[PDB]
């Protein structure tokens, strides 16, 4: 079965690829776009204001082959801030499609 160390190595590469994108991807059309980020789980691109942002289930997941068309979601508000969880500075995310 899939080991911790195999999963850590894949995560490190996912992170490396994400950091490359964060650095190299060109600026968004306006500063009202929400900002790209790596949140330790997924690599988020800039977001259009007032829209859902979707990215593929992270490929380092042990069960990635069982969620090949799954997406995780954030919502980018019209103010250029990611939608936040109540009582929290943390962003709302829906990762239900990527669960084992």
């Amino acid at each position: 079965t899939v080991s911790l160390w195999e999963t850590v190595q894949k995560w490190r590469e996912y992170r490396r690829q994400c950091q490359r994108s964060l650095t190299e991807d060109p600026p968004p059309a306006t500063d009202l776009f929400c900002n790209r980020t790596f949140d330790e789980y997924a690599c988020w691109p800039d977001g259009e204001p007032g829209s859902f942002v979707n990215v593929s289930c992270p490929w380092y997941l042990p069960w990635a082959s069982s969620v090949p068309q799954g997406h995780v979601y954030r919502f980018c508000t019209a103010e250029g801030l990611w939608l936040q969880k109540d009582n929290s500075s943390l962003p709302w995310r829906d990762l239900s499609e990527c669960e084992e």
Binding site: T1, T7, Y41, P62
Partner: peptide, 28 residues
């Protein structure tokens, strides 16, 4: 039924799953 090797594989599998859960929490 279940064998010891099922338990040992379960435990290895859980090490990776706990790592994922830790990432989902923000790796804090």
């Amino acid at each position: 039924g279940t064998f010891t090797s099922d338990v040992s594989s379960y435990l290895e599998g859980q090490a990776a799953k706990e790592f994922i859960a830790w990432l989902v929490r923000g790796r804090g």
